[PDB]
Amino acid sequence: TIKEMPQPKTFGELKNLPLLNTDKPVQALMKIADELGEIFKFEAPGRVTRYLSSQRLIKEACDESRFDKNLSQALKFVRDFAGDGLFTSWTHEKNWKKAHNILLPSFSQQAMKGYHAMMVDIAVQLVQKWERLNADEHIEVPEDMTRLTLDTIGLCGFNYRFNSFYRDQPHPFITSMVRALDEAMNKLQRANPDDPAYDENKRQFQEDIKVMNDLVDKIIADRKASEQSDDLLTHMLNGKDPETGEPLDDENIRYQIITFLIAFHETVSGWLSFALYFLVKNPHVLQKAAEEAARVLVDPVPSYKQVKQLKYVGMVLNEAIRLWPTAPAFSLYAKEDTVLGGEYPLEKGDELMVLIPQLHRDKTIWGDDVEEFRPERFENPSAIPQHAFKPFGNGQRACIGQQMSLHEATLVLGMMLKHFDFEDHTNYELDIKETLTLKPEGFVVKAKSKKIPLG
Amino acid sequence: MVDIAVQLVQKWERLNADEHIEVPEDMTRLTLDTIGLCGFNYRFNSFYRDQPHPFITSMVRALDEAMNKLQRANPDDPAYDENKRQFQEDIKVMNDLVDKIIADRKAQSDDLLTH
Amino acid sequence: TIKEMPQPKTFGELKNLPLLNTDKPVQALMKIADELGEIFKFEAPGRVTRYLSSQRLIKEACDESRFDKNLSQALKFVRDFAGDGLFTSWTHEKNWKKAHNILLPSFSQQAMKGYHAMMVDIAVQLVQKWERLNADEHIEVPEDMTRLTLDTIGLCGFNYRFNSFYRDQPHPFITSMVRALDEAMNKLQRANPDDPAYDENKRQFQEDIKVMNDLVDKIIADRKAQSDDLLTHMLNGKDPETGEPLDDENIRYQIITFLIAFHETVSGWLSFALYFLVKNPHVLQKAAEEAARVLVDPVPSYKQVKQLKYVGMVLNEAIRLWPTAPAFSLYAKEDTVLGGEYPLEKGDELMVLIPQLHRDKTIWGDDVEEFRPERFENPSAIPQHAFKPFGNGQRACIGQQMSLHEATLVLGMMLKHFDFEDHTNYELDIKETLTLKPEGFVVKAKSKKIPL
Ligand code: FDE
Ligand code: FDE
């Protein structure tokens, strides 16, 4: 019964690393996961990990009493600019639970109602832009979603205006940020991080982190000066942890600000972008959501309440995040010696990787019709098996911004359906850009304005 | 006219505290957007851009060249060959683009172009 | 250590950088080599490099176990629009060995047979253009070689027709490339790249990269509309270690790479040959002789192109004296000593001055400046690593066989069909981008009245 784990082709001292020397590792680890089955060992020079694909094994791994969140090599590299912020801290380090407890109030429903106003502001801007296009013009969707999410998190979280829609070239902050995430990704695969090809990358990497820290330090200045503010940021400053009494040190604040900017803008852009893809490729589904939009959004601008009505829109969004979870994987380590799924013994500290895309393609759980996009799977969510659908991580370390995001996409996705008809004028073949997050690349549409006015 | 004017007010409204306004540029963004909409029902979306429009830059470079020819004591000197080559490159840019304005109509509104 | 290395005149904190404040940097490095000898140190504000000119030292530097291809400051700047292409990639970079193994098939002698036909297509267009000239006119040689070499790489390589011969002011792409290449060279001389005076330059350059990515990235889509060509090998070939084909953006980098390197090296190469032919009329005679004897069909055959032995020798002797890509760079894989005289730290940089190597008197004899193609009658007599016009080792020029075939083919057809006059007594003047071409070179050609 105590069976040895499969391992793909191994090279010399560099182990399995060349297998993942692509610009699309997750898509590659998938095409490897499909080849080796539910679990395989993947060694890199000096590190060892196990990648999981079946719900059967994942149900075992989501026991928080046996496994705790581990920092993947990937996260260890983002920690180079996100430090011990909520995403990249150990759940036992001091600053995790401190910051988790001071900030959690800011994301429950009760707090969401406060954000709803500024969310609509940024969305009206997106719709205003799509209305103001000339006839043969097009929409670059991932780019405009990027404008949207960064403008949305920065305003709700920090009362700071990026004014992305007032720009053609991405906000320079986004250019540096994306290249920093790209660098963390590439450093994973470096067959020799020494030899000179990578010296300018060292230059660029530090130069880009400085870029991010400057505007962060400008957000902190903008507040030391500008107010009745119910913020992520006010809870970060004035907020005190109720157990040891103190507030966050400045350094951890800086890591939290960057953390919040990045995670929201990257996962939420990818989500909406994917959502449009699957909608434009399945038009009756688009039709079905396109009437939920018209039916519920009966005032010129949506109210917080109206967003929770949009049941199918939530269903669409869920089925999209199921197929391509923009945060495709999270990592766990064994709290102590154990046997996983009764077959595989592991010493304490062994690391696990959940390939959320591959879990979400499990036939025993989701059926034989997985890769087809049918939002109707998410209609009795209680019918959905436990630990089968984990796009938002797991346990106490699950995504704190889940509801904020679900609220964000649904509102934005809802208004898009209300005000426009969308044409896949290019017959776009799906191209997934991979930083550490996922999102469609070069995705373009044409949008016919339904000519409904705004407020 | 009001439409373009609200965009300016909204842009200045949406600026952060430490920022300022570059006045000629935003007036230029305004004036061009207003004539393009009132006159020819074409939307430049200057307020959605950071680097100026290809058309506006050609127009600005062409005007500067017209001015620059006033002090040229002999316009045939080879020193001005690149200045000549760009002049025509910008005339094409404007002349091509204007016909883009013409395409939107024959391919219907009380406007300057209709007359 | 034994030997302190020479170094030319230094300008305080600006080091010897002003020494190449010519429009002719390479020629200046030659003038320095001619006086300081087989090796000299050349210092710039942020970098230091050593220039080698004797076959003695070059044989050591071409040891692939001690030295690898380095990106000189020059190639580092081309990396801004040629990115990760073969020419501007590091060996240990992930896309080099990847792209290198998929593309070697497209340039093997076997691949040439397929390129031969489209090679001819563009070659007749050139011949027809010359046949249709009126008598009072002349031929602007570099311009027509640029038209040809670009149309040939674009047609034979990617099945895209630039149609340069149907236009007089050059293609926007080619004008953009040359201006982008000129900017790379222009930077070398800026000890203050942040200074605002370079804003229009930085602007135009950024606009020029957009021009290249525009056409090229459209071509990759325009084919997904498959034949047996270079682009198909890129779209369809698979790497055996990850099993993946080449990146979409990497292909954009290769196409840009191939277009430039071919059109810039081969056009310069042909032009230089023609200069030497009109300046050495007896060599011109014997070359047209073989041309007349071998080129017996209305169209050349692949076999016949190989059967030109003297035309190839003129080509080899041309690239010897003025190698159109004049230099390559190396770095020390580990600490080592060069020529037993000059110790090198790990990472120290070397520059090979191919023109100066190709003038090493101890190797070629004392008539090194004379155009004597018979030096190539016995190519095995030439010492290993004395004649490196295509670089060295695994980083050697991937297209040298494609190039030789094109130059041999075209040069053959020219010799069959025209007689050439140096009607202006043209003095050789070398334009330097990073590559070398002659400037203002003009001839008149009287047709031998022969059909195609
Ligand atoms: C703001 C925001 C937004 C968002 C969104 C999202 C989407 C769309 C998707 C997602 C996801 C996720 N997340 Fe997310 N998100 C966020 C966030 C976050 C944070 C902070 C975190 C960490 C948490 C803790 O616990 O600390 C996360 C988290 C998360 C996760 C897990 C990680 C680990 O490593 O474990 C996942 C998988 N997220 N997400
Ligand atoms: C297509 C084509 C054509 C051509 C031609 C030519 C002529 C006539 C001359 C020449 C050259 C040369 N090349 Fe050349 N060519 C080409 C290409 C190329 C490439 C891709 C390369 C890179 C490869 C490697 O190395 O990786 C080269 C490469 C080359 C070289 C080396 C570079 C360095 O830096 O090392 C040299 C020297 N080429 N070349």
mmCIF file of C-alpha atoms in Angstrom, chain A residues 118 120-129 132 151 155 159-166 222 454-455, chain B residues 6-21 47-48:
data_model
loop_
_atom_site.group_PDB
_atom_site.id
_atom_site.type_symbol
_atom_site.label_atom_id
_atom_site.label_comp_id
_atom_site.label_asym_id
_atom_site.label_seq_id
_atom_site.Cartn_x
_atom_site.Cartn_y
_atom_site.Cartn_z
ATOM 1 C CA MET A 118 -16.574 54.071 -5.134
ATOM 2 C CA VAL A 120 -19.583 52.203 -9.120
ATOM 3 C CA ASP A 121 -17.500 55.341 -9.734
ATOM 4 C CA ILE A 122 -14.701 53.346 -11.345
ATOM 5 C CA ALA A 123 -17.149 51.192 -13.271
ATOM 6 C CA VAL A 124 -19.003 54.168 -14.733
ATOM 7 C CA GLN A 125 -15.649 55.365 -16.030
ATOM 8 C CA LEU A 126 -15.111 52.064 -17.852
ATOM 9 C CA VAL A 127 -18.568 52.154 -19.353
ATOM 10 C CA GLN A 128 -18.137 55.839 -20.159
ATOM 11 C CA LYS A 129 -15.011 54.939 -22.100
ATOM 12 C CA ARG A 132 -17.155 57.122 -26.188
ATOM 13 C CA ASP A 151 -8.356 52.095 -10.122
ATOM 14 C CA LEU A 155 -9.654 54.128 -4.387
ATOM 15 C CA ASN A 159 -8.598 56.882 -1.446
ATOM 16 C CA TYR A 160 -5.890 57.320 -4.111
ATOM 17 C CA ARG A 161 -6.600 58.057 -7.778
ATOM 18 C CA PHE A 162 -4.475 56.329 -10.370
ATOM 19 C CA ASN A 163 -6.694 57.842 -13.115
ATOM 20 C CA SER A 164 -5.777 54.948 -15.390
ATOM 21 C CA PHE A 165 -8.504 55.773 -17.853
ATOM 22 C CA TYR A 166 -6.725 59.077 -18.332
ATOM 23 C CA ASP A 222 -1.317 61.744 0.550
ATOM 24 C CA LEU A 454 -25.780 56.684 -16.605
ATOM 25 C CA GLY A 455 -25.900 58.784 -13.442
ATOM 26 C CA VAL B 6 -17.619 67.879 -18.125
ATOM 27 C CA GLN B 7 -14.758 65.532 -18.973
ATOM 28 C CA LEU B 8 -12.324 68.317 -18.109
ATOM 29 C CA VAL B 9 -14.138 69.120 -14.885
ATOM 30 C CA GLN B 10 -14.244 65.425 -14.002
ATOM 31 C CA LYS B 11 -10.519 65.019 -14.755
ATOM 32 C CA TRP B 12 -9.510 67.942 -12.607
ATOM 33 C CA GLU B 13 -11.968 66.801 -9.955
ATOM 34 C CA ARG B 14 -10.350 63.355 -9.911
ATOM 35 C CA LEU B 15 -6.799 64.619 -9.377
ATOM 36 C CA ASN B 16 -5.013 63.803 -6.140
ATOM 37 C CA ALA B 17 -3.825 66.496 -3.747
ATOM 38 C CA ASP B 18 -0.092 66.507 -4.554
ATOM 39 C CA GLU B 19 -0.793 66.812 -8.295
ATOM 40 C CA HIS B 20 -1.170 69.912 -10.450
ATOM 41 C CA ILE B 21 -2.675 70.792 -13.821
ATOM 42 C CA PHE B 47 -8.635 62.916 -21.984
ATOM 43 C CA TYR B 48 -8.086 59.162 -22.337
#
